[PDB]
Design a protein around this nucleic acid. Sequence first.
RNA 1: AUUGAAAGUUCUGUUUCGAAGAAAACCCGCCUCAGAUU
Length: 60
Amino acid sequence: PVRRTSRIKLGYMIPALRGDEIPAQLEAQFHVRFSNKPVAIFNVEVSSALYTFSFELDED
RNA sequence: AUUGAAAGUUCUGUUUCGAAGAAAACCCGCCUCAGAUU
């Protein structure tokens, strides 16, 4: 085996836990596809947060 | 350079079509700004 570690390090994107409130929400939205011969429904989760992330790179 | 090193759960879809808060009803019946002055 041969190995080579990545030169760029990235971490998870998590909203800031600042103060006593978490500024993030998550709701479910309902969507329909229209057809002329019914015999057509799906749901998707949407969010809105305040994200923060940090990274490292070694150009040397 | 660490049971570490390499990995997108991603692509495609209308909550649409139609339906007058409408008809009836007096705010109204009585009252002085009046007597004195070059």
